[PDB]
Amino acid sequence: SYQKLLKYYVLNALKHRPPKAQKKRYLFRSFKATKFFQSTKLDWVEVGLQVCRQGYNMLNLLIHRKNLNYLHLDYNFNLKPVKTLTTKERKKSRFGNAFHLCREVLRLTKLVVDSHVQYRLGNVDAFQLADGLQYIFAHVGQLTGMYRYKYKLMRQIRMCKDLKHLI
Amino acid sequence: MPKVKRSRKAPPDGWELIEPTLDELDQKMREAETEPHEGKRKVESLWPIFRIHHQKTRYIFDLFYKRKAISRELYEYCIKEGYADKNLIAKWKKQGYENLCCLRCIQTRDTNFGTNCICRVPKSKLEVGRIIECTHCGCRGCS
Amino acid sequence: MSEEKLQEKARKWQQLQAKRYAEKRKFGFVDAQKEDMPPEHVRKIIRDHGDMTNRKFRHDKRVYLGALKYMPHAVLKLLENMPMPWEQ
Amino acid sequence: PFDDEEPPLDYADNILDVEPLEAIQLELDPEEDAPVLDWFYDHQPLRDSRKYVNGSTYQRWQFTLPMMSTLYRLANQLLTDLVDDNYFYLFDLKAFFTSKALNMAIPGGPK
Amino acid sequence: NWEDADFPILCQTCLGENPYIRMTKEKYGKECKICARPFTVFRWCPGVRMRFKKTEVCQTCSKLKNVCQTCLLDLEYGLPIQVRDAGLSFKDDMPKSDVNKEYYTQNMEREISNSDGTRPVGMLGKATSTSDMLLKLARTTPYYKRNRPHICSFWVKGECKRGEECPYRHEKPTDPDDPLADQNIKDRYYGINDPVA
Amino acid sequence: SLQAPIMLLSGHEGEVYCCKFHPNGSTLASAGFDRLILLWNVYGDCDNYATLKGHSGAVMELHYNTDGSMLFSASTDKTVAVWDSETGERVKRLKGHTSFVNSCYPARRGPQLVCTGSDDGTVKLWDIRKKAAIQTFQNTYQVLAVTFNDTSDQIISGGIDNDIKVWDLRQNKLTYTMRGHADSVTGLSLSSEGSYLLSNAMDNTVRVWDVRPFAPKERCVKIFQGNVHNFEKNLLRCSWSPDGSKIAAGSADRFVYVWDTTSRRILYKLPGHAGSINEVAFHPDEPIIISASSDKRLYMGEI
Amino acid sequence: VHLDPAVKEVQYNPTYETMFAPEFGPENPFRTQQMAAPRNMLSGYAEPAHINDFMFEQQRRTFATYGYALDPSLDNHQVSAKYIGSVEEAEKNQGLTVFETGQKKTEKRKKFKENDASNIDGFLGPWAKYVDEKDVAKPSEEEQKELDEITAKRQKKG
Amino acid sequence: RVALEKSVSQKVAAAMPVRAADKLAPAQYIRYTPSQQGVAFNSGAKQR
């Protein structure tokens, strides 16, 4: 693990082209210059619950707009068929790597946010919250399945194991 | 049951004489959050939030600039804890802007033609007696 | 003409030049800042817009789908500001 | 943590009124950790103090040597004891670049 | 194609009685009610108690048939299309079935874009020969009663909870036992069985 | 005609309230609503080089000295900044009005003097060396335009009372009143001889008035027409040609009128201006006209 | 008398005699009101104006409040000025705008006020309703029955 | 080259749709002569 982390450091240091000075772009400054955006201040757990609900709503609005009424996205971002599908329904409802990769990013964020929610409900602990987040960021390849829809994430996953052997 | 504080130091001196009403305003806000929309229009259901937010901020503003009943420390505690709005107060201290609804109703980025809402037009300069309800706010004539 | 009409013409030139050359109407006048909103506004908007199955909000059904293409970016900032186990 | 068919909990009633918990936040000595104890577990600790940072953009910090000493002996568990970089003679960045340029590996280094 | 034009084609009883008009321009806002290819939507308020009218059809569907983009009445005489085609000839014959309509639309728009962009493309030579009976029933004064908010459908059920703040009219809707109340958009456009006409 | 057919002078972000030709005529400096004054070399390729900032108002009036070495312009914030043509540095600022300075003129020949007029109803005489007003003439209505005679004895002021007023520097009294406008006077300018003063007004008529030791006593010497004012209520300024043969005055109908000095006949009426025109100026040697307008562009007409 | 009638954008500086002399000959009879007017695209002539924002919106709100305004035409019938609108109220109220202190000041409407923010469920700062005009507007005694009739006639169709 | 670079820029604007998302306030005026003059139609004027 130490040898692999050294290799990662050397590959970071070697292919370092200089920052290539661009024109600054400021996406969130152009959003709040429009009339469609407001700004407030909120607890992090509340915004995380909001982001999980919004991503859930986006994904099953994409499901319900494609008339795929025989699929179900549960609240932990598993996509399951409600019934047994025909050949035509199975050829119709096959999603690509974009939908599934975004679904698994939302699964990882809901794991993190639900860890904070069960902290803020008084259900778990503070130390068990820290250990739960450490397990989440050490075991994404075992808790999500992001690797199936983009395989290059193994570069990340092995690295987390190296850090788990480092610490 | 009350608002969870985020200071964790004890509140300042004159806290105990403004708390029944702050908690009563805070209980009033939790009513408006949970009202189901049925015969309330899409913009109309958010109007009580801006009214009660106006009321809480006006209450601390009256106790510090009019009645002089509160120190700087208790005043700035209520701003930090979210009982009063810092930006709404800073507009009420301006010259013409003294019964303002919202910060939406003077924001010129929020309108099509880059202007305030008709909320902010003096009722004598409408000269007709038309009835106004601002869509942002529900207001009938600040200015 | 008469003194009253000249006084009226002077008054309706003074008010005109006052409101037409105000300091908030100069060339590079950047107008005021958008300020913070009460935190209950977004809360009741998310509460009323539920699972988007209500008929009343059907016109927003299109807008939410477009916001899907920014849900990675909204993820990043969400996890960029995770609150630090010494924080409540 | 939550089951698959459980709808997500609303913040305004399940979480908004609950007192959160005790955080982790190690107990500091009031005499030995004196120039640090008042502010050490705040979010952006010395933010509204003009003597130690600028403003609320929170960009440039200016501490005193007791503060740097106290922050230094609070962080000994994550730091090293290497005073000079002569430790990294064949084990540093340019050495590993020379190793990658050739076919050589280092016995404790990358391949 | 798209349309993307500046300053719509309007008459004077739709553009309001104020010489000072604010309108917004939306680049590809809606689709045409006839052509179904999207165009630039212009939207203004006519007066004070009016309705916020907007343009309904393309620049092209008003170039082909010499009408206003929101009321679909003539620019010069101000009468329905079936009346003006009755007081003239009818040699346009725009197709109503789908693929023929879009094909004819593409080709006539190519003929428009292969010209100056100022004249009625086929209606000009037959617009020289004019001054029929249609000049003797053309409306002289503006009919500002079109620019008028709809009947409040909560007030018809006696449940208008806005009351005096409701901008919609609290007055009688027209009896549906009337030929004058069917009025399709496309029937008014193509000059087929318009009861006003 | 000298190297000028028409060109186009741009750079301005707001209406160009005033522009004057270099006393030499080789170079030019303009300013307006943009709170910027622009100098573009007239000859060669007509390109600006030096910009003079330092104004928290509308550089309403812009002027030049006989030499033209020192240029002084009047802003809308009640402060006048004096800038030399060379090196462009705010060199002598004089602040004495309580309201907007509408216009300023610099006395030629005699020891340096400057006159200003404002919405406070006063007219003030400034000596550039004193940092203080020398004389103050309270009118009662807003003053829009002011000019000195060539003898530096008299101040000529146009206001909103429709009556041009003449002030005596020694007596400090209302020496003369001129009747003949039906509405506010927006712009006054003396002939290079001292002989005649040109006026624009909201009464729809350009009037020449003759100022002399021996005057007819009813000095409506000539009247010209064509120049339109409207709801914009822009200050309108007019200019004399280098030889006094031509009269130019801007209008709100985007037309550069230029009448014949002796026959009062519209010599020119050029177009090419989108927005209302605020000032028209003549090159001191050649037949070149600079037209400045609210469309933020300049033209160099050549006759 | 020297230049083409309309091509556009003359490269030399013209004279008033060489551009604004009228066209000779009689008009052709083969043009209508739309075809004889110098129109730009099918409905008239549109050119970019550069009117001041304040003065524009002043006259606009003056018309929208009262019913009169100044004329924004370039020349029109040649003349320095005139008013366009309900002309009788212009000279009546001396031609004032909305942005100026009015002449008429009478008959102001009456509304509630409880500006203290201390009495919960009694505060209405700027949300105060009028005392005279009232909410939900039920129509009339016969308007209801005739609307029931017209909805019943709608029911006989579908 | 000036004529072709404009169409090049209009084609290239598709490639990155929103990096520094768009900004708009050139709110302008146009003077319009209605060309169907009536005594009462505009209200009382030749233009608008």
Ligand SMILES: [Zn+2]
């Ligand atoms: Zn409001």
Ligand SMILES: [Zn+2]
């Ligand atoms: Zn408002």
Ligand SMILES: [Zn+2]
């Ligand atoms: Zn208001």
Ligand SMILES: [Zn+2]
């Ligand atoms: Zn169309």
Ligand SMILES: [Zn+2]
């Ligand atoms: Zn129409």
Ligand SMILES: [Zn+2]
């Ligand atoms: Zn109603």
